Amino acid sequence: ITGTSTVGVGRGVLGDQKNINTTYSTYYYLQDNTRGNGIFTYDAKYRTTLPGSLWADADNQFFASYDAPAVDAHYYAGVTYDYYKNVHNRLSYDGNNAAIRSSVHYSQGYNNAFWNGSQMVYGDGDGQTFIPLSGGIDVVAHELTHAVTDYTAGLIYQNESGAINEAISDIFGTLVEFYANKNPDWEIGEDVYTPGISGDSLRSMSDPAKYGDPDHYSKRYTGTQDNGGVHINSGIINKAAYLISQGGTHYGVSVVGIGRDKLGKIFYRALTQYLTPTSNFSQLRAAAVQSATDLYGSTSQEVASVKQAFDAVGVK
Ligand SMILES: [Ca+2]
Ligand SMILES: [Ca+2]
Ligand SMILES: [Ca+2]
Ligand SMILES: [Ca+2]
Numbered sequence: 001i002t003g004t005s006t007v008g009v010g011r012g013v014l015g016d017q018k019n020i021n022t023t024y025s026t027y028y029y030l031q032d033n034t035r036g037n038g039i040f041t042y043d044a045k046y047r048t049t050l051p052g053s054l055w056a057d058a059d060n061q062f063f064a065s066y067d068a069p070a071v072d073a074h075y076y077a078g079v080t081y082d083y084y085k086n087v088h089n090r091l092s093y094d095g096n097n098a099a100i101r102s103s104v105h106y107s108q109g110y111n112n113a114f115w116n117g118s119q120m121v122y123g124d125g126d127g128q129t130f131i132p133l134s135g136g137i138d139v140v141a142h143e144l145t146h147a148v149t150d151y152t153a154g155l156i157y158q159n160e161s162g163a164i165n166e167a168i169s170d171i172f173g174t175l176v177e178f179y180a181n182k183n184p185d186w187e188i189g190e191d192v193y194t195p196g197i198s199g200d201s202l203r204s205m206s207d208p209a210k211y212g213d214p215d216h217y218s219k220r221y222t223g224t225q226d227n228g229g230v231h232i233n234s235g236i237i238n239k240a241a242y243l244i245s246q247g248g249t250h251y252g253v254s255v256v257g258i259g260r261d262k263l264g265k266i267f268y269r270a271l272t273q274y275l276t277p278t279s280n281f282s283q284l285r286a287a288a289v290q291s292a293t294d295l296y297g298s299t300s301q302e303v304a305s306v307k308q309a310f311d312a313v314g315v316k
């Protein structure tokens with residue numbers, strides 16, 4: 001809609017208060033005009049019809065419990081946009097400031113979130129396995145990163161290339177979590193998963209095998225479930241990425257960590273410059289070595305650590 005940019009206030013899924021950019025025109029809408037061609041948040045009204053209605057509010061105050069997932073979807077999409085702009089010089093997901101759209105209150109008791117080719121979509125959860133999924137910044141950044149991948153490398157959602165597609169979204173979801181810097185960790189979905197059980201998460205990057213995911217290529221899932229294990233075999237790449245950043249010894253191979261910022265730069269370059277729709281794990285290793293080489297020199301510690309990290313997870 002056309003109107004006047006302003007700032008409202010609300011409370012997110014976890015009960016925290018935040019300021020959100022809104023637009024005023026009779027109602028106040030969840031439309032942030034300060035970022036690219038805009039961030040837009042929609043109410044799907046417990047249906048599966050998308051996008052639903054642009055979120056309208058009478059008083060620019062968003063403290064109702066119905067409001068909470070909208071507040072967080074809108075706010076964390078802004079943070080994710082800011083991460084890509086400030087850290088990687090990328091304007092929105094397509095690199096030309098495409099408008100970012102999210103719908104919340106999708107369906108009834110829906111325990112997931114996704115990018116559907118055109119926008120983000122967030123379920124409310126069933127209240128015991130998940131609370132509303134937009135409450136996790138790693139989840140929001142994970143979904144938006146799928147749009148980035150789709151506009152760059154185009155990794156197909158199947159088999160090894162799909163596992164890479166998933167790992168990239170976990171990796172940047174985590175980097176965005178650290179960027180916003182409120183209790184960042186190397187776990188995925190911990191803020192919105194199983195409100196009744198503390199200390200757990202959906203997936204772990206530091207130790208994928210904690211939830212039964214492979215942490216070595218020898219343990220890869222070779223069956224047909226989950227599109228050939230795109231959410232399972234991503235553990236192998238997530239572990240490699242954790243080692244590149246933080247360091248450690250894994251299956252007897254020692255890796256000197258080079259830190260989060262270099263991890264991000266190396267993987268963003270691999271993604272946007274060297275990966276293709278059918279890239280496999282061995283091709284990712286090559287893309288990542290070449291990226292680190294480009295950025296830091298063939299005889300750097302950075303290149304050395306990328307090699308040891310992929311050796312440690314058994315990717316040659
Ligand atoms: Ca209100
Ligand atoms: Ca966290
Ligand atoms: Ca996390
Ligand atoms: Ca939990």
Ligand SMILES: [Zn+2]
Pocket residue numbers: 142143146166169
């Ligand atoms: Zn994903």
